[PDB]
Design a protein around this ligand. Structure first.
Ligand SMILES: O=c1ccn(C2C[C@H](O)[C@@H](COP(=O)(O)O)O2)c(=O)[nH]1
Ligand SMILES: O=c1ccn(C2C[C@H](O)[C@@H](COP(=O)(O)O)O2)c(=O)[nH]1
Lengths: 315, 315
């Protein structure tokens, strides 16, 4: 059905998987080079064989579209995906006096109480960001995330480029350009970076009255991370169709290392026995139109009827 | 056989082609999103159903690998592909006194003698670049081509980054990195550019002892331009295997708008009736090893037995 392209992508790695060590050797089955297409006029690519939080997808897409870099917008939308990127530098200088949280990702995972001390000093940190302009301003700002790469590229001779906002004036005035790319990869500040962008680039395209978008994902954690990535970029494809006064066609996901983290093998076999359900259908607020100054309430998901959720081990 | 992935890519555009105007409306049949793989241990992807100049492929790849930007290296290797990018600014100021060559690409195409005056003032220009250091230095330097993007990215706080030379120290010391990308797309100087890079990026990958490379081509002229692109990047895949002391696996070509220029339809039907011949096999000089300071003589093609050539109308 609509997601069938996803569930085969997980079976091919279950058959071509080269075991590849990486991580800290930790374990992967991977393929290199894969492309899967979703026809967004049949429905929205949110999985029906795992319940995926559409709420944490739109909160983050609209952080991206507002051009935002600050953990504070996400936290005051209960969406906590980016938190330890900034809870990481909290565990760094000056005011960091007290607990350990020392490359903590490792020890909460293996912990009775290392994790709860991790878990509390983190909400200490979080309801701080929510509450003082100076802490928030200092440590809640990640610097180089997608809102800053998409809406403010940093130039020599200091400017900021709005990459997004210029390819959409470009899709309004020249529908047939093959130069409609946004690149989240700047190669200058990429070794001075903690997580090199994974959505490296995407490219839109107008065929007869309708818009599509293709994405180069440099590395994708098949089970835990692709469920979420398919709907973030098939959301943005509906939103820029919205603003360009166009119709909606295809979302093409193309992949570099597509992998299955090894600690995740029993779980993805379980969803692999489930049978699809019909996918939801997304509609968007008709009367506001500039997506950049949209809020949660203008995006709704109807008839999402998921299977239950499959809980992680994480990546 | 080995190239069979190419000839089907031309038949799918002959069946899915949306006619798309572009050019100056001029004419195209295109698809959006396509991926074709070549297993480089069966042989080299140079077409056997068109004779493709392996000589103009390696001259240009080694310009790229030397980090060169100057029409002069290519001209003193009889390879003239980049010439009118710099013959274009010749038709610009100061010393440009005399002929017309005014967006000339158009009028030589439709010309009795507009073209020969185009054709002579161009060799005037060419054996000039070959002969004075100042003209050559001034107009034979294109500025932003692949040697300058691959081997000298331009940073804020003026440096130049060697993108290539760092991912190969990276493939020698960390074979399993999914962050091995080179991007030829800088989004700052891309509207102040005549031809936005078409090979936007590529990404290498080490699976068990062997190297592969995947390429995102933003726009590719199926008949006249892909024959050449497959062997330029499947050359570079053999050359960096060479230097990393590794083996050779796959070349994955992934595509954005793959198109068939309309003036080219009878010609690509003709090659489409030909039957493959076995592809050549490339060997490289064993005893020199740093590819960056290689010359023509270290790359040889054996048993290339092509069909005849199919002459263009151009793109
Ligand atoms: O939603 C997400 C989150 C993470 N990753 C990945 C891919 C790898 O598992 C890891 C990044 O590691 P590198 O590929 O950058 O080493 O995170 C995704 O693909 N999607
Ligand atoms: O060897 C080549 C030469 C040119 N092009 C292309 C693609 C388009 O035909 C044109 C570039 O036009 P834009 O896509 O940049 O508009 O040149 C290639 O793909 N390969």
């Amino acid at each position: 059905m609509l997601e069938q392209p996803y569930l085969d992508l997980a079976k091919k790695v279950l058959d071509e998987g080269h075991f590849k060590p990486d991580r800290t050797h930790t374990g992967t089955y991977s393929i290199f080079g894969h492309q899967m297409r979703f026809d967004l006029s049949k429905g929205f690519p949110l999985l029906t064989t795992k319940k995926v939080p559409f709420g944490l997808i739109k909160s983050e897409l609209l952080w991206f579209l507002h051009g935002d870099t600050n953990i504070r917008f996400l936290l005051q939308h209960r969406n906590h995906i980016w938190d330890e990127w900034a809870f990481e530098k909290w565990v760094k200088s000056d005011e960091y006096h007290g607990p350990d949280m020392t490359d903590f990702g490792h020890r909460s995972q293996k912990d009775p109480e290392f994790a709860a001390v991790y878990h509390e000093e983190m909400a200490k940190f979080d309801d701080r960001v929510l509450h003082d302009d100076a802490f928030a301003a200092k440590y809640g700002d990640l610097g180089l995330v997608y809102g800053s790469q998409w809406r403010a590229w940093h130039t020599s001779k200091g400017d900021t480029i709005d990459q997004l906002g210029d390819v959409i004036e470009q899709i309004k005035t020249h529908p047939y350009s093959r130069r409609l790319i946004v690149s989240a990869w700047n190669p200058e500040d990429v070794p001075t970076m903690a997580l090199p962008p994974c959505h490296t680039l995407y490219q839109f395209y107008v065929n007869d009255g309708k818009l599509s978008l293709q994405l180069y994902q440099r590395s994708a954690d098949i089970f835990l991370g692709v469920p979420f990535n398919i709907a973030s970029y098939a959301l943005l494809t509906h939103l820029v169709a919205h603003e360009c006064g166009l119709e909606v066609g295809e979302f093409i996901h193309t992949f570099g290392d597509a992998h299955l983290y090894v600690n995740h093998l029993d779980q993805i076999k379980e969803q692999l026995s489930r049978t699809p359900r019909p996918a939801p259908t997304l509609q968007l607020n008709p009367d506001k139109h500039d997506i950049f100054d949209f809020d949660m309430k203008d995006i709704k998901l109807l008839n999402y009827d998921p299977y239950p959720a499959i809980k992680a081990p994480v990546a």
